[PDB]
RNA sequence: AUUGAAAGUUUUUUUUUUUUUUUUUUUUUUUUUUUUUUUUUUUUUUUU
C-alpha cells in the first residue's frame, strides 16, 4: 500500500502511573504512528477464484472495514482502524469456476463506489458464499 | 689366404578431410514485527 496523504506523529507512553503503589515514574517509552486521515492505495488480485471464494474475501474485507478486525501493532490500545472510501472491483474472465459455485446475479465487471455502497453492491457474493455448501476438506 | 671377390634393400609419399556436448529446466511454497505500560505525583493567584 502506497501512502498518498500520509502524516506522521509521535506519542509517548512513558507514563508508568501509580503502578498500584507509590512509584509514579519507573520506565519510559514512546512510539511513532501514522496519524489519522492518511490514504493508502490498496490492490489485490486473484486467479481462478470461484464465486464463493470471492464472497468470502469480501466478507473478510467487510469485517476489516467495520472494525471487528484491526491491523497494526497496538491493537489492544485501539491503534489500527482503517476504512475504504473508494474501491474498484474489476472482474475479467468466467463468472463461475467450479461446480460448487453459486450462480450469482450478474453485477457486471466494474464495481466501485464509496465503501458502504461498495459493500452493499457485493451483497450477492457474500450471500452466495454464506449459502454455499463447502465440500472440502472431505475428512 | 674359404672355388671367391664386391656391392646399404635403398631410395620417394604429412594418417589427412567432414562434426559447436547441443535442446529443454523461473531457488519457489507457506509465516500480520506483536505483547503487557494512565505523560503521572508535589505547588492556596497571591502581601507593607
Automatic annotation (TrEMBL):
The keyword Transferase does not apply. Keywords: Antiviral defense. One of its GO terms (biological process) is defense response to virus. The keyword Transmembrane does not apply. It comes from the Archaea. This is CRISPR-associated Cas7 paralog (Type III-D). The chain holds residues 140 to 278 of 278 of the full protein.
